[PDB]
């Protein structure tokens, strides 16, 4: 059916799926794949916000999340294997 594809880009869909997995690896304290998931998430969110934006102001939705994902990786670097 619609399955978010009618309103959300495939890059934005990818970004969130991988951002969700970043937290899954991190909060399990695997501290292995987590770091690269946190940075790869914002790699897509910034490619959406700067080049593929929607809803005029609505692009601010990713700006709030991406600013956390690039910062929260620096906390993993304490124990990141």
UniProtKB/Swiss-Prot annotation:
Q: What is the superkingdom listed in this entry's lineage? A: Eukaryota
TM ranges are none
List, for all copies, the residue spans of the domain called MIT: 8-81
Q: Which residues form a coiled coil?
A: 23-81
Tissue specificity field? Ubiquitously expressed.
Q: List where in the cell it is found.
A: Late endosome membrane
Give the record's subunit note. Proposed to be monomeric or homodimeric in nucleotide-free form and to oligomerize upon binding to ATP to form two stacked hexameric or heptameric rings with a central pore through which ESCRT-III substrates are translocated in an ATP-dependent manner. In vitro, associates on the inside of a helical tubular structure formed by a CHMP2A-CHMP3 polymer. Interacts with CHMP1A, CHMP1B, CHMP2A, CHMP4B and CHMP6. Interacts with VPS4A; the interaction suggests a heteromeric assembly with VPS4A. Interacts with VTA1.
Known function: Involved in late steps of the endosomal multivesicular bodies (MVB) pathway. Recognizes membrane-associated ESCRT-III assemblies and catalyzes their ATP-dependent disassembly, possibly in combination with membrane fission. Redistributes the ESCRT-III components to the cytoplasm for further rounds of MVB sorting. (Microbial infection) In conjunction with the ESCRT machinery also appears to function in topologically equivalent membrane fission events, such as the terminal stages of cytokinesis and enveloped virus budding (HIV-1 and other lentiviruses).
Q: Which protein family is it in?
A: Belongs to the AAA ATPase family.
Domain text from the record?
Answer: The MIT domain serves as an adapter for ESCRT-III proteins. It forms an asymmetric three-helix bundle that binds amphipathic MIM (MIT interacting motif) helices along the groove between MIT helices 2 and 3 present in a subset of ESCRT-III proteins thus establishing the canonical MIM-MIT interaction. In an extended conformation along the groove between helices 1 and 3, also binds to a type-2 MIT interacting motif (MIM2).
Annotated protein name in UniProt: Vacuolar protein sorting-associated protein 4B
What gene makes this protein?
A: VPS4B
In the complete protein, the residues contained here run 1 to 77 of 444
